[PDB]
Every structure is written in C-alpha cells, then in structure tokens.
Design an enzyme around this catalytic site. Structure first.
Site, PDB file in Angstrom:
ATOM      1  N   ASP B  25       0.829  -1.203   0.000  1.00 38.89           N
ATOM      2  CA  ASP B  25       0.000   0.000   0.000  1.00 38.89           C
ATOM      3  C   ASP B  25       0.864   1.254   0.000  1.00 38.89           C
ATOM      4  O   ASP B  25       1.354   1.682   1.049  1.00 38.89           O
ATOM      5  CB  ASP B  25      -0.938  -0.014   1.208  1.00 38.89           C
ATOM      6  CG  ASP B  25      -1.957   1.099   1.161  1.00 38.89           C
ATOM      7  OD1 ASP B  25      -1.894   1.911   0.212  1.00 38.89           O
ATOM      8  OD2 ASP B  25      -2.824   1.149   2.061  1.00 38.89           O
ATOM      9  N   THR B  26       1.014   1.863  -1.179  1.00 41.86           N
ATOM     10  CA  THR B  26       1.753   3.111  -1.308  1.00 41.86           C
ATOM     11  C   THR B  26       1.063   4.284  -0.620  1.00 41.86           C
ATOM     12  O   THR B  26       1.692   5.330  -0.441  1.00 41.86           O
ATOM     13  CB  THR B  26       1.961   3.443  -2.788  1.00 41.86           C
ATOM     14  OG1 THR B  26       0.691   3.617  -3.429  1.00 41.86           O
ATOM     15  CG2 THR B  26       2.732   2.327  -3.482  1.00 41.86           C
ATOM     16  N   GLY B  27      -0.200   4.137  -0.234  1.00 39.90           N
ATOM     17  CA  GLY B  27      -0.928   5.182   0.450  1.00 39.90           C
ATOM     18  C   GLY B  27      -0.779   5.191   1.951  1.00 39.90           C
ATOM     19  O   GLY B  27      -1.343   6.063   2.615  1.00 39.90           O
TER      20      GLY B  27
HETATM   21  C1  LIG Z   1      -7.877   6.791   1.722  1.00 40.88           C
HETATM   22  C2  LIG Z   1      -7.240   6.455   3.084  1.00 40.88           C
HETATM   23  C3  LIG Z   1      -5.713   6.680   3.018  1.00 40.88           C
HETATM   24  C4  LIG Z   1      -5.387   8.196   3.060  1.00 40.88           C
HETATM   25  C5  LIG Z   1      -3.953   8.437   2.564  1.00 40.88           C
HETATM   26  C6  LIG Z   1      -5.033   6.007   4.267  1.00 40.88           C
HETATM   27  N1  LIG Z   1      -5.204   4.513   4.231  1.00 40.88           N
HETATM   28  C7  LIG Z   1      -4.383   3.746   3.217  1.00 40.88           C
HETATM   29  C8  LIG Z   1      -5.306   3.319   2.032  1.00 40.88           C
HETATM   30  O1  LIG Z   1      -4.546   2.639   1.124  1.00 40.88           O
HETATM   31  C9  LIG Z   1      -6.444   2.447   2.565  1.00 40.88           C
HETATM   32  C10 LIG Z   1      -5.975   1.043   2.955  1.00 40.88           C
HETATM   33  C11 LIG Z   1      -7.246   0.217   3.266  1.00 40.88           C
HETATM   34  C12 LIG Z   1      -7.956   0.409   4.603  1.00 40.88           C
HETATM   35  C13 LIG Z   1      -9.216  -0.398   4.924  1.00 40.88           C
HETATM   36  C14 LIG Z   1      -9.767  -1.383   3.898  1.00 40.88           C
HETATM   37  C15 LIG Z   1      -9.060  -1.571   2.552  1.00 40.88           C
HETATM   38  C16 LIG Z   1      -7.800  -0.768   2.233  1.00 40.88           C
HETATM   39  N2  LIG Z   1      -7.413   2.266   1.507  1.00 40.88           N
HETATM   40  C17 LIG Z   1      -8.683   2.994   1.457  1.00 40.88           C
HETATM   41  O2  LIG Z   1      -9.152   3.530   2.425  1.00 40.88           O
HETATM   42  O3  LIG Z   1      -9.329   3.011   0.199  1.00 40.88           O
HETATM   43  C18 LIG Z   1     -10.766   3.476   0.159  1.00 40.88           C
HETATM   44  C19 LIG Z   1     -10.933   4.089  -0.872  1.00 40.88           C
HETATM   45  O4  LIG Z   1     -11.063   2.964  -1.909  1.00 40.88           O
HETATM   46  C20 LIG Z   1     -11.735   1.847  -1.153  1.00 40.88           C
HETATM   47  O5  LIG Z   1     -10.845   0.462  -1.330  1.00 40.88           O
HETATM   48  C21 LIG Z   1     -10.257   0.235  -0.206  1.00 40.88           C
HETATM   49  C22 LIG Z   1     -11.127   0.929   0.824  1.00 40.88           C
HETATM   50  C23 LIG Z   1     -11.728   2.170   0.045  1.00 40.88           C
HETATM   51  S1  LIG Z   1      -5.369   3.745   5.804  1.00 40.88           S
HETATM   52  O6  LIG Z   1      -5.326   2.284   5.723  1.00 40.88           O
HETATM   53  O7  LIG Z   1      -6.628   4.095   6.459  1.00 40.88           O
HETATM   54  C24 LIG Z   1      -3.915   4.416   6.704  1.00 40.88           C
HETATM   55  C25 LIG Z   1      -4.061   5.746   7.454  1.00 40.88           C
HETATM   56  C26 LIG Z   1      -2.840   6.319   8.170  1.00 40.88           C
HETATM   57  C27 LIG Z   1      -1.521   5.552   8.122  1.00 40.88           C
HETATM   58  C28 LIG Z   1      -0.289   6.138   8.814  1.00 40.88           C
HETATM   59  O8  LIG Z   1       0.770   5.278   8.618  1.00 40.88           O
HETATM   60  C29 LIG Z   1      -0.036   7.472   8.109  1.00 40.88           C
HETATM   61  O9  LIG Z   1      -0.084   7.268   6.708  1.00 40.88           O
HETATM   62  C30 LIG Z   1      -1.380   4.243   7.353  1.00 40.88           C
HETATM   63  C31 LIG Z   1      -2.602   3.662   6.626  1.00 40.88           C
END
Ligand SMILES: CCC(CC)CN(C[C@@H](O)[C@H](Cc1ccccc1)NC(=O)O[C@H]1CO[C@H]2OCC[C@H]21)S(=O)(=O)c1ccc([C@@H](O)CO)cc1
Lengths: 99, 99
Positions: B25-27
C-alpha cells in the site's frame, strides 16, 4: 516514470480544468477526492475503510490527467482525509508495483 | 516481481514465523496489521482512515519478510480490516511505482 516511496507519492492531477495534488494509493480500490464542483450528474454513494464510511458524490466517466497520463473513470468526491488515486485509475495509466 | 493493480496487491508476508496476507500500500506511511498479540513494549498511536481515526499499538523494529526480502521497522497493530504494508517497509525491499 519510476517513483520511489521514501516520500508520499504525491503527483499533480488535472480534473475539470483544475490542477490538484493527489496521492497514488495502491491500497485504494477507488479514487476519492476532496469536495469540489464537477460538471455532470452524480449519484450519492458510500465508501468505507479504516474508521468507517463517508458519504461521497459519484461522478462517472470523468477525464483526469495523472502526471501526464490520461484516465477516464469514476471519481468519488467527498470529505476524504487525502486526495487518493485508486486502482480504478492506476490501472488505466498502466501503473504497476515492482520490486 | 511485477504486480498489476487489476486486483488488490495482496502478498504473503511472514512476521514471527506466522504467514499473513497483506496489501502493498503506497498510500500508507507505516505498516498497519490486524490485531495480533505481539510481545514487548509498544506506544499508543492514532491513525486517520477514510472513515475517521482508530487507536493502534506501535511496535518498533519488527521483522517482516516479503517475497524473499527482509524488512525491519515500525508496525502498527489494531482493529484494521486489512493488513497493509506501508512505505516504511516497501522502501526497504526496493519497491517502486512504474507507469
Ligand atoms: C484513503 C485512506 C488513506 C489516506 C492516505 C489512508 N489509508 C491507506 C489506504 O490505502 C487504505 C488502505 C485500506 C484500509 C481499509 C480497507 C481496505 C484498504 N485504503 C482505502 O481507504 O481506500 C478506500 C478508498 O477505496 C476503497 O478500497 C479500499 C477501501 C476504500 S489507511 O489504511 O486508512 C492508513 C491511514 C494512516 C496511516 C499512517 O501510517 C499514516 O499514513 C497508514 C494507513
């Protein structure tokens, strides 16, 4: 290009004629942008992740240029913590993970 | 390996001899793992997801093996619906985004 991950992979995008900064997010199924005006009709949708769900406006078949590459697809607009480009558009610009 | 984004970029990881499935996860700045009773000291932390914040336990200097590459760094443990490998470890295995 090839983008390393020592910094957040933030890139400039162009949508609705406006430039914005967004995070390339391989963990996001979908693309979610902060509240903005976009032309055309939208449908109310819910999208969820860590913490729960938020209400978003779903725009279909929206042109979005990502670091010079064009995509046309679904954009969700709502109170997201960060502008994120998800896999629905990352696939369109041919983005892969490599190691 | 090259990982396309047609589907979620799930890979097997090894942490404490335990095998789990996790998103590359690059996010995510840091790695976030589903609840697991790791030994040792930790410090409380809050991370903001799309739906709001959750509380997690921060463990430092944790070894995670990813497709034959060993990375060691911070791991956050809490009530996440998915295991995500964040940039803190992706950088160590030489992971890049390419398009
Ligand atoms: C958009 C949220 C981003 C904001 C940058 C942040 N998240 C990463 C993101 O990849 C997240 C991973 C994910 C979570 C739950 C279920 C499936 C995938 N995917 C996600 O929410 O996607 C949304 C949109 O599309 C849908 O598909 C998947 C779900 C829907 S996080 O996990 O909450 C997080 C927050 C803070 C930190 C600390 O380390 C500081 O960074 C690390 C990780």
């Amino acid at each position: 290009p090839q983008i390393t991950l020592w910094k957040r992979p933030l890139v400039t995008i162009k949508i609705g004629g406006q430039l914005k900064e967004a995070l390339l997010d391989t963990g996001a199924d979908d693309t979610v942008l902060e509240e903005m005006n976009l032309p055309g009709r939208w449908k109310p949708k819910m999208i969820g992740g860590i913490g729960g769900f938020i209400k978003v406006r779903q725009y279909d078949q929206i042109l979005i240029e990502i670091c010079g590459h064009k995509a046309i697809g679904t954009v969700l607009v709502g109170p997201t913590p960060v502008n994120v480009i998800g896999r629905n558009l990352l696939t369109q610009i041919g983005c892969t993970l490599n190691f």
